Design an enzyme around this catalytic site. Sequence first.
Site, mmCIF file in Angstrom:
data_model
loop_
_atom_site.group_PDB
_atom_site.id
_atom_site.type_symbol
_atom_site.label_atom_id
_atom_site.label_comp_id
_atom_site.label_asym_id
_atom_site.label_seq_id
_atom_site.Cartn_x
_atom_site.Cartn_y
_atom_site.Cartn_z
ATOM 1 C CB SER A 47 42.535 32.300 43.088
ATOM 2 O OG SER A 47 43.929 32.188 43.333
ATOM 3 C CE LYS A 50 43.464 34.581 46.760
ATOM 4 N NZ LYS A 50 43.888 33.373 46.001
ATOM 5 C CB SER A 95 44.356 36.221 42.771
ATOM 6 O OG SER A 95 43.853 34.928 43.049
ATOM 7 N NE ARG A 227 42.170 33.225 33.901
ATOM 8 C CZ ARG A 227 42.806 33.666 34.980
ATOM 9 N NH1 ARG A 227 42.878 32.919 36.074
ATOM 10 N NH2 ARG A 227 43.377 34.862 34.956
HETATM 11 C C1 LIG Z 1 53.652 27.254 37.857
HETATM 12 S S1 LIG Z 1 53.526 28.839 37.123
HETATM 13 O O1 LIG Z 1 54.774 29.514 37.305
HETATM 14 O O2 LIG Z 1 53.018 28.677 35.797
HETATM 15 N N1 LIG Z 1 52.413 29.668 37.956
HETATM 16 C C2 LIG Z 1 52.801 30.733 38.895
HETATM 17 C C3 LIG Z 1 51.780 31.842 38.964
HETATM 18 C C4 LIG Z 1 51.415 32.564 37.839
HETATM 19 C C5 LIG Z 1 50.428 33.530 37.904
HETATM 20 C C6 LIG Z 1 49.773 33.812 39.101
HETATM 21 C C7 LIG Z 1 48.642 34.771 39.153
HETATM 22 C C8 LIG Z 1 48.686 35.892 39.981
HETATM 23 C C9 LIG Z 1 47.658 36.819 39.973
HETATM 24 C C10 LIG Z 1 46.564 36.636 39.148
HETATM 25 C C11 LIG Z 1 46.488 35.520 38.325
HETATM 26 C C12 LIG Z 1 45.268 35.275 37.475
HETATM 27 O O3 LIG Z 1 45.232 34.222 36.794
HETATM 28 O O4 LIG Z 1 44.359 36.138 37.496
HETATM 29 C C13 LIG Z 1 47.531 34.598 38.326
HETATM 30 C C14 LIG Z 1 50.152 33.086 40.228
HETATM 31 C C15 LIG Z 1 51.136 32.119 40.157
#
Ligand SMILES: CS(=O)(=O)NCc1ccc(-c2cccc(C(=O)O)c2)cc1
Length: 242
Positions: A47, A50, A95, A227
């Site tokens: 992301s 973006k 995101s 992070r």
């Molecule tokens: C394979 S999984 O199941 O572990 N991942 C699926 C998943 C988990 C979290 C997000 C998301 C969504 C919005 C923000 C953020 C961020 O980091 O700011 C991460 C997207 C997709």
Amino acid sequence: EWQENKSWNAHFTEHKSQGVVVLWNENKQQGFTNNLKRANQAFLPASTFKIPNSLIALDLGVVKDEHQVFKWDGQTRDIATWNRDHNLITAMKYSVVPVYQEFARQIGEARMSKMLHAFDYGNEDISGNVDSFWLDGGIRISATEQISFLRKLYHNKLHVSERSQRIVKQAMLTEANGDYIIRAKTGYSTRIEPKIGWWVGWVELDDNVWFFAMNMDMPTSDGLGLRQAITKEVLKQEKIIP
Ligand SMILES: CS(=O)(=O)NCc1ccc(-c2cccc(C(=O)O)c2)cc1
Ligand SMILES: [Cl-]
């Protein structure tokens, strides 16, 4: 020049983590990192892409401005904030992948490839599906390459209009108080190993700007908050923020 400061490794060890933080002092034109090797290792941007995606969509007129509403397609996804209407600001904040996948489809392969080469962005390789290559395609970028890209954006030196760059920097706004402003973008790459989290951007001070780019191993989503937390600890240690 560049300078390796392995004392920062403690901030990753402290949290049972591995990663790299790269800092760039714009006034002094000096860089700092805990791990010169990983600073130059290229990962999926996820992301963080973006940022360039927003720039391209705006410059080509795919996105008219930061108020244009992108209607939810009515398909329920596992992230609740995605199941609603968005504009550029909120799509970046949360995101929202499906909004940016539509951007990429309207941009198209040819214009996307030309623009990333013009940006000198990473390995400039969009191999894969046009609507997912930054998640599971061939594009790769290192922490040091993120900083080079961000510095051009800050100075309005990317090969898109000034307006496009100003709008994206507005959409990158993450935190602001009396002491500093952070414009940044998170990333979370899971489709190809190693799974990593990103945080890239810069810290605006009264009389200097510190660019930063970090990535870290992210075996599960439980550690995503690290992070920003790890980055800010480094910024605090270097007395960049209180
Ligand atoms: C394979 S999984 O199941 O572990 N991942 C699926 C998943 C988990 C979290 C997000 C998301 C969504 C919005 C923000 C953020 C961020 O980091 O700011 C991460 C997207 C997709
Ligand atoms: Cl702003």
